[PDB]
Structures are given as structure tokens and as C-alpha cells.
JSON list of C-alpha atoms (C1' of nucleotides) in Angstrom, two decimals:
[
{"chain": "F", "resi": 1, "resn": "UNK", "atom": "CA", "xyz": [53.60, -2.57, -43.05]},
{"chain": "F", "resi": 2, "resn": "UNK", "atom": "CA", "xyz": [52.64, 0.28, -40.85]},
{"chain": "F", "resi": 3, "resn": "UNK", "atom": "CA", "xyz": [51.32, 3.99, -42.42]},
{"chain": "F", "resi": 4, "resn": "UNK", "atom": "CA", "xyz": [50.50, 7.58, -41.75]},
{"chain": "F", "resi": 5, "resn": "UNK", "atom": "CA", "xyz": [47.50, 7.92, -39.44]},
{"chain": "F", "resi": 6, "resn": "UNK", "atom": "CA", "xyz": [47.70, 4.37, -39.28]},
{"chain": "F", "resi": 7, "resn": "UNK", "atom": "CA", "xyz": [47.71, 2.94, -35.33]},
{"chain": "F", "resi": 8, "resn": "UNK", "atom": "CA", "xyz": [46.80, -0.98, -34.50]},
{"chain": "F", "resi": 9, "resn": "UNK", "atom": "CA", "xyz": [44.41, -1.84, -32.01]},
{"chain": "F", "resi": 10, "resn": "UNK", "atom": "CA", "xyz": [45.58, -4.59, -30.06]},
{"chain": "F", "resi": 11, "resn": "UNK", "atom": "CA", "xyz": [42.59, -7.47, -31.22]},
{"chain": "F", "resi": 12, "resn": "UNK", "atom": "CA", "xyz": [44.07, -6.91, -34.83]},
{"chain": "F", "resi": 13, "resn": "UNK", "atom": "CA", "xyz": [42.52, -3.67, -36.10]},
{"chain": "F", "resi": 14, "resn": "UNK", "atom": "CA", "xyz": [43.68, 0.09, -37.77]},
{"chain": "F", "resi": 15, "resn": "UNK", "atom": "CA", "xyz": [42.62, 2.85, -36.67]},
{"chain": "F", "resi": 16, "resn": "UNK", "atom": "CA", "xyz": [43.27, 6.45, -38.67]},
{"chain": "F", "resi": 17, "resn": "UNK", "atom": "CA", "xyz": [44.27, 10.05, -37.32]},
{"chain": "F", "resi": 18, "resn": "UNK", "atom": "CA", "xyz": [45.55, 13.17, -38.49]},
{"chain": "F", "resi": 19, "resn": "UNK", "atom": "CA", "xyz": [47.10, 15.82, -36.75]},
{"chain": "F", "resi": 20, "resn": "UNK", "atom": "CA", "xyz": [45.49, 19.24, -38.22]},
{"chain": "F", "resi": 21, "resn": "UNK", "atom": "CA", "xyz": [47.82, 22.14, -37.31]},
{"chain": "F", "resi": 22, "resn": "UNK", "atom": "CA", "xyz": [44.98, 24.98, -38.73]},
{"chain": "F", "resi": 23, "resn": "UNK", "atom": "CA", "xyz": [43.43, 23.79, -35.53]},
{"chain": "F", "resi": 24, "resn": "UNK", "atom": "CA", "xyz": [46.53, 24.59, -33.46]},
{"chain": "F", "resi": 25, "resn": "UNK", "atom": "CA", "xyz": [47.65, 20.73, -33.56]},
{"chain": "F", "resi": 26, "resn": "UNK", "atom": "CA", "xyz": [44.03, 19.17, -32.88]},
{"chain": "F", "resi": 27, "resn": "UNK", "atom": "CA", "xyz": [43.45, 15.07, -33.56]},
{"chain": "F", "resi": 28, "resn": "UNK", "atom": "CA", "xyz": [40.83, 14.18, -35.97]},
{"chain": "F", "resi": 29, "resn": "UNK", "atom": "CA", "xyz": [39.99, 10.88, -35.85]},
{"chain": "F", "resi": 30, "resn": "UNK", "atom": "CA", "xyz": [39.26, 9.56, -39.41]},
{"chain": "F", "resi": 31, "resn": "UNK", "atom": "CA", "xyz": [37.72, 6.03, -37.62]},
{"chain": "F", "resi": 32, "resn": "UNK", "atom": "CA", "xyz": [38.84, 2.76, -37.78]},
{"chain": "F", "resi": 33, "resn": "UNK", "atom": "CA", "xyz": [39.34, 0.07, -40.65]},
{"chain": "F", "resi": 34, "resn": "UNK", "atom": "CA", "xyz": [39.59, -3.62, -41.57]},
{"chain": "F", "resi": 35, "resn": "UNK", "atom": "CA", "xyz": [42.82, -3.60, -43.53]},
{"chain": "F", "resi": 36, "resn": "UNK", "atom": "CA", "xyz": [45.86, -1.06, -43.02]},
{"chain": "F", "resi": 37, "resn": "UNK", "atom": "CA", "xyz": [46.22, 0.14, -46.34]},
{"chain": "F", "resi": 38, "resn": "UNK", "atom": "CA", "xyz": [41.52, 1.33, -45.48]},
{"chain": "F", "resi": 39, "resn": "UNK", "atom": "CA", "xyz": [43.04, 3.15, -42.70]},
{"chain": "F", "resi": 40, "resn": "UNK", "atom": "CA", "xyz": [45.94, 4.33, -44.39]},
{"chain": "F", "resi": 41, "resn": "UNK", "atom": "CA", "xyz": [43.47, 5.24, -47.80]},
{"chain": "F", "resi": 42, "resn": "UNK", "atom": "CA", "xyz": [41.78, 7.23, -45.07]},
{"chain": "F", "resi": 43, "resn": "UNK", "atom": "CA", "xyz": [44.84, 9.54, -43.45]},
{"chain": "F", "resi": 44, "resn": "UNK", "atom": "CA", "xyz": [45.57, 9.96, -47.36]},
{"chain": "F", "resi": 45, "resn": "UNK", "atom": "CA", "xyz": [42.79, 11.78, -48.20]},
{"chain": "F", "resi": 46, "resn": "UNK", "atom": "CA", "xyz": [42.67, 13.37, -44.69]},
{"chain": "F", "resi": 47, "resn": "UNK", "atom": "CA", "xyz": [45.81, 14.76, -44.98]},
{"chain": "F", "resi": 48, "resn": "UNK", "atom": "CA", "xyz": [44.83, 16.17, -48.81]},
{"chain": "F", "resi": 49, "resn": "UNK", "atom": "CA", "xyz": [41.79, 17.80, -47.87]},
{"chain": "F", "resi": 50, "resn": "UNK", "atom": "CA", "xyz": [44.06, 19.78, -44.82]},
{"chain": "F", "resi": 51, "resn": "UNK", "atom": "CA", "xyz": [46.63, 20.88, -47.44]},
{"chain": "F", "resi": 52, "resn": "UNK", "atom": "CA", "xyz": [44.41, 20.85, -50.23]},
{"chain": "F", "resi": 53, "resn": "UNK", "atom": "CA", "xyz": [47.26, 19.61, -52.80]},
{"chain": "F", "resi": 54, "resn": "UNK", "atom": "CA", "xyz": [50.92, 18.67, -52.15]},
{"chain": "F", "resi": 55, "resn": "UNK", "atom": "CA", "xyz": [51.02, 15.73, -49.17]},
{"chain": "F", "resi": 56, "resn": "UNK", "atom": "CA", "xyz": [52.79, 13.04, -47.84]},
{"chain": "F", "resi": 57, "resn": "UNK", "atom": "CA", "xyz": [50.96, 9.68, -48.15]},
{"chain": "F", "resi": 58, "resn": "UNK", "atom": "CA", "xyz": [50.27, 5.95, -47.91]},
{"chain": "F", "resi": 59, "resn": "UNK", "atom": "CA", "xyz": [49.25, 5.66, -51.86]},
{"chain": "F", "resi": 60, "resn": "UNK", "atom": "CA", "xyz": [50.60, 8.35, -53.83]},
{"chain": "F", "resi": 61, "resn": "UNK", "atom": "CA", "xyz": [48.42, 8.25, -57.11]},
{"chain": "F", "resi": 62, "resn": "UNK", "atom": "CA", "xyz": [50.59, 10.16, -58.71]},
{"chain": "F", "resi": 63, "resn": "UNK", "atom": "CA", "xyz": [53.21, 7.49, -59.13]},
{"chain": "P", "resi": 1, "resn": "DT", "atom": "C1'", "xyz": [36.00, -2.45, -29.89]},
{"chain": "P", "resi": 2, "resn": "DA", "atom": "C1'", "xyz": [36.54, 2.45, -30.88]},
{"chain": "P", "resi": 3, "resn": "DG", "atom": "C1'", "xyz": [37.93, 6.64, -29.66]},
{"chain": "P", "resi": 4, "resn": "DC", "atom": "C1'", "xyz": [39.88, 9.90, -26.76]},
{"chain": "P", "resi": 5, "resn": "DC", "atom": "C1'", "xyz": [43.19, 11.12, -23.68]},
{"chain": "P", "resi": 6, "resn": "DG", "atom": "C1'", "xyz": [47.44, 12.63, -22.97]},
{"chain": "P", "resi": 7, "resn": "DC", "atom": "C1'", "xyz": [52.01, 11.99, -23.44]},
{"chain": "P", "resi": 8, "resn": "DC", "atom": "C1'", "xyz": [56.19, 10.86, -25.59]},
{"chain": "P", "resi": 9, "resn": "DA", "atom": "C1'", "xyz": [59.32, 10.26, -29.05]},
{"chain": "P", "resi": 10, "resn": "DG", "atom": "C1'", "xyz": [60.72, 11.15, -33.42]},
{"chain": "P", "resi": 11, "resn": "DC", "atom": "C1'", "xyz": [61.26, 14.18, -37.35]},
{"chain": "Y", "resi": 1, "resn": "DG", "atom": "C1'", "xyz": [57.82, 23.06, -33.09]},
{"chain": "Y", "resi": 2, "resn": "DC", "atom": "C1'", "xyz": [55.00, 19.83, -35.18]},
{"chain": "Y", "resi": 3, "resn": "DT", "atom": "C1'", "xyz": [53.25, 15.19, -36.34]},
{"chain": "Y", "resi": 4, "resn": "DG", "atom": "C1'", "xyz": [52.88, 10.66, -35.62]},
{"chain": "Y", "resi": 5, "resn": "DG", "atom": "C1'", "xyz": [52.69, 7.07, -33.05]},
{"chain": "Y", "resi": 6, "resn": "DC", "atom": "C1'", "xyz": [52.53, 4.94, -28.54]},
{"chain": "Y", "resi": 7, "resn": "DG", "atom": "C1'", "xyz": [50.18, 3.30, -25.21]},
{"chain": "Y", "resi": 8, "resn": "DG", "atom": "C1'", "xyz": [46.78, 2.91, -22.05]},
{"chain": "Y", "resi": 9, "resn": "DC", "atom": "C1'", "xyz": [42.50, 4.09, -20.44]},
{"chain": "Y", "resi": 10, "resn": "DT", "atom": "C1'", "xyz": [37.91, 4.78, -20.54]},
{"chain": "Y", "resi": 11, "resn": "DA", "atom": "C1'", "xyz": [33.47, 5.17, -22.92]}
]
DNA sequence: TAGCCGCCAGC
DNA sequence: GCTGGCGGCTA
């Protein structure tokens, strides 16, 4: 699978960005991760702390 | 190898 | 118009 934020690195790696539009569109690089679903953990609480509630995610805990 | 650039395509 | 993702480049 591929995820939000979530961009291979060609040697087998997943990085994790945002796009934050508060900052007029600005990249914020959350790092990089082992596994896809790290990197995707990692836009998911990115992307909460920009909206502070109500997102669209890689793990919804809410189902 | 990671991150940033910068752009492009897609939504 | 914005976001994500591409993709490559450079650090």
C-alpha cells in the first residue's frame, strides 16, 4: 500500500510530509521511517495537530 | 540516505 | 486552489 505523506525512497524506504496551508502551502517534513504504515502513523498525527480534530488519515482510530 | 527543491498532476 | 505525490537532485 501507499499513504498520505507517505513517499518511497528508491533503496526501499518512507519518507513523511505534510502540506500546511496556515503557512501559505509550506512542506513540513515529518522524517523518514522503516515501515509505511511509521511514515504514514506520522502524516496522521501531522495532519491532526494542523486541523486540530476532523482529518483525513492512514489509521483512523476512530473506526 | 534523507531532505529539500521545485514541479507536476491530481483532487 | 490546494495537497499529495513525483521525481530528481543535492546536501
Amino acid at each position: 500500500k501507499h499513504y498520505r505523506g507517505v513517499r518511497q525512497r528508491p533503496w526501499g524506504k518512507f519518507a513523511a510530509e505534510i502540506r500546511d496551508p496556515a503557512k501559505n502551502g509550506a512542506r513540513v517534513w515529518l522524517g523518514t521511517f522503516e515501515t509505511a504504515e511509521d511514515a504514514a502513523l506520522a502524516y496522521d498525527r501531522a495532519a491532526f495537530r494542523m486541523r486540530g480534530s476532523r482529518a483525513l488519515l492512514n489509521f483512523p482510530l476512530r473506526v
